């Protein structure tokens, strides 16, 4: 199933108080009106890729979803983040957990911390080893799909775990449909009111109107013509053309000669009509110093 | 626990200790004469008692004497690309001392491993625990070592007779990250009483300036620490003692 991500998933990108101002910031936000995947909890908890940041949304009435598991293999071979909420305690670990064949909750350890009607929206991202988790709870009266409207996301948790996570799975309480979207490096124009709260945001890479909006850093565009960007056709393939060189150049012999000349009569051999690889020069560890001054060594092939 | 540790980890599994919820002095490290190299360009070591950082990580590892020059931004070498890569915009101060009387044995200390073979340069602050056998030749390597199949980890023979270029050196990289989050690792400077309705040279969590500190009605959310205006100047600050 698929759903349109109307306006949800906009968050405070940093923690500097701003008020009554339109500020542009480029960060990992989910695109407006993009396709988000829809999961059900009737009669379904697969693993999804944690590529660059995930936005999660859940509609809840009886507290079914109680935790999440993030990692790469999820088989006690590596450290995997497990967050669980038992009704009084929130527990976050990255321990060498022994996961079940199908992880659920019924009715080398490095870290441990212990403390429809309700829409709970979250965003999970990993920046420089820091796991940022933002969340917000709101009352809703809607059973079919996710509601239409705007809601700014406030940050809650920042954990310095320093773990590479690429896949994640949720934890459900078994005796509740949810939505998952992906973040992208987009530039958003955020509006701070007089209370300092973000009341609106424009994904200005959505359409020409939003492009004009963020080029003019305003939510209102007057009548007229405005230059917004520059289009340029991108190349589709690379075309390398070099002479049909037929002779590898005797670079080995100037290193493997019987005797070398002295410094007072150093020999100057011109190298011409040659194919120069220099890879055997890089990989060989017999050299004491390898110092290139004009051109970088790796950019010679 | 990080400077006078019993044993240091090798560069293939270098320890990354997060230092938080304490007072960082660095005064005993400046007066210590047993240290060999103490180099850093981003931040000066003398202006740390008044300045405060958000967080700091200690990257400790044992490396050879002649390889201590490779742990620096802009350097190129075997260790700088296969075991410990430092970014070009790295801020922080690195310390290194000799361990010729600790990590040495009669027959040789072979408990320190370093990566020698890798098909790609390491990322900044990347920890490569990959044990897969490197494939040097054109034939595929199915985990069996031999021709064109080498183990990327190698060891040195540490003896008290070896030269200063082959002696083991304990290197600790103190990398400071400064974010807008509330700081926790500040210098050893005592605080004083606060005065209002008069402009004074203030210094809150390393952020210094001059001006009047007046009461505010701006509702700062939990982890708000500093306020920035259109001119990127400080507009409001949160006292670390009183919320």
């Amino acid at each position, epitope marked *: 199933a698929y759903t349109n991500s109307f306006t949800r998933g906009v968050y405070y990108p940093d923690k500097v108080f701003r008020s009554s101002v339109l500020h542009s910031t480029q960060d990992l936000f989910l695109p407006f009106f993009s396709n988000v995947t829809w999961f059900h909890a009737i009669h379904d908890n697969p693993v999804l890729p944690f590529n660059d940041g995930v936005y999660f949304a859940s509609t809840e009435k009886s507290n079914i979803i109680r935790g999440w598991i993030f990692g790469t293999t999820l088989d006690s071979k590596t450290q995997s983040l497990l967050i669980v909420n038992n009704a009084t305690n929130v527990v976050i670990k990255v321990c060498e957990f022994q996961f079940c064949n199908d992880p659920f909750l019924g009715v080398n350890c490095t870290f441990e911390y212990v403390s429809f009607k309700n829409l709970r929206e979250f965003v999970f991202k990993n920046i420089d080893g820091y796991f940022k988790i933002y969340s917000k709870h709101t009352p809703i009266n809607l059973v079919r799909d996710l509601p239409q409207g705007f809601s700014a996301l406030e940050p809650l948790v920042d954990l310095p775990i320093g773990i590479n996570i690429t896949r994640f799975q949720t934890l459900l309480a078994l005796h509740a449909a949810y939505y998952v979207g992906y973040l992208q490096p987009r530039t958003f124009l955020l509006k701070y009111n007089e209370n300092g709260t973000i009341t609106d945001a424009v994904d200005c890479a959505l359409d020409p109107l939003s492009e004009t909006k963020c080029t003019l850093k305003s939510f209102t565009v007057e009548k007229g013509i405005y230059q917004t960007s520059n289009f340029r056709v991108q190349p589709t393939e690379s075309i390398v053309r070099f002479p049909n060189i037929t002779n590898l150049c005797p670079f080995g012999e100037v290193f493997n000669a019987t005797r070398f000349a002295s410094v007072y009569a150093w020999n100057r051999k011109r190298i011409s009509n040659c194919v120069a690889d220099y890879s*055997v020069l890089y990989n060989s*560890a017999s050299f004491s110093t390898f110092k290139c001054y004009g051109v970088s060594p790796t950019k010679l092939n | 626990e990080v400077f006078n540790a019993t044993r240091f980890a090798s560069v293939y599994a270098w320890n990354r200790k997060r230092i938080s919820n304490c007072v960082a002095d660095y005064s005993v490290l400046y007066n210590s004469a047993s240290f060999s190299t103490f180099k850093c360009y981003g931040v000066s070591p003398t202006k740390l008692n008044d300045l405060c950082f958000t967080n700091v990580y200690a990257d400790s590892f044992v490396i050879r004497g002649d390889e201590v020059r490779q742990i620096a931004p802009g350097q190129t070498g075997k260790i700088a690309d296969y075991n410990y890569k430092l970014p070009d915009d790295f801020t922080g101060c690195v310390i290194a001392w000799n361990s010729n009387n600790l990590d040495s044995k009669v027959g040789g200390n072979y*408990n320190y491993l370093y990566r*020698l073979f890798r098909k790609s340069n390491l990322k900044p602050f990347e920890r490569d625990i990959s044990t897969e056998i490197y494939q040097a030749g054109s034939t595929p390597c199915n985990g069996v*070592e*031999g021709f064109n199949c080498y*183990f990327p980890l190698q*060891s040195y*023979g540490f003896q008290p007779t070896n030269g200063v270029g082959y002696q083991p050196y304990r290197v600790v990289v103190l990398s400071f990250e400064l974010l807008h989050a509330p700081a926790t690792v500040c210098g050893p400077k005592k605080s004083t009483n606060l005065v209002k309705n008069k402009c004074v040279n203030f210094n809150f969590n390393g952020l210094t300036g001059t001006g009047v500190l007046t009461e505010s009605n701006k509702k700062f959310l939990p982890f708000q620490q500093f306020g920035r205006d259109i001119a990127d100047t400080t507009d409001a600050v949160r006292d670390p003692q009183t919320l």
Partner: antibody
Amino acid sequence: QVQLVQSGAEVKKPGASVKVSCKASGYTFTGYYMHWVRQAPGQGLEWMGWISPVSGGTNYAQKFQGRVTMTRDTSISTAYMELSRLRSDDTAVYYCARAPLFPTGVLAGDYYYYGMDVWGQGTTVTVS
Amino acid sequence: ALTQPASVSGSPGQSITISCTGTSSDVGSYNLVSWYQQHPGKAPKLMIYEGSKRPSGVSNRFSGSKSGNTASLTISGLQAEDEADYYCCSYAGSSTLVFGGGTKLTVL
């Protein structure tokens, strides 16, 4: 100044096991894969296996796969080779051997090249 | 796995050759053939390695040659001390240091 010493002569019964030590000095111990060769009295040489003192890598001959076991102690720079399920034709002289170059031969076809340093003697005799 | 003559005789001062024939997959595709000398009851000594390269200290009288699928040891100026067994060596595809029938060199 490369010095190599092995254990003494040993006698074993058929079906038992034998453990020989191989203690080296004067060079970087882990920088040389240790090869092993056996020779029956009055016969030719017979290579048996090699061990990597670094990371503990080892590989045996398909002739002896399952009967011979190696370990090594880098703290004292020694190798140890064990022959299990001994029979009559294992009465022979055994050496370890040091490979020629360093394991930095991008080409240095190591450690499959050869043996420059051969050890003194270990004679294992297996008779009822 | 390799074949070499069992015993060949020579005279003092003579230049003598010792053959060792392999296949195209072990000696014919690799320039990695060698020659070892061992005296009776003695430890073997590597005389020729990596085709014709010699370890330090070995006399120049021992040289090597390779032709198609054949290795050849050459000894210039045969002496009485040259009496020993000579083995050819070549990589064969798997573990490991292999040999020949053994060439016992005798002087007349």
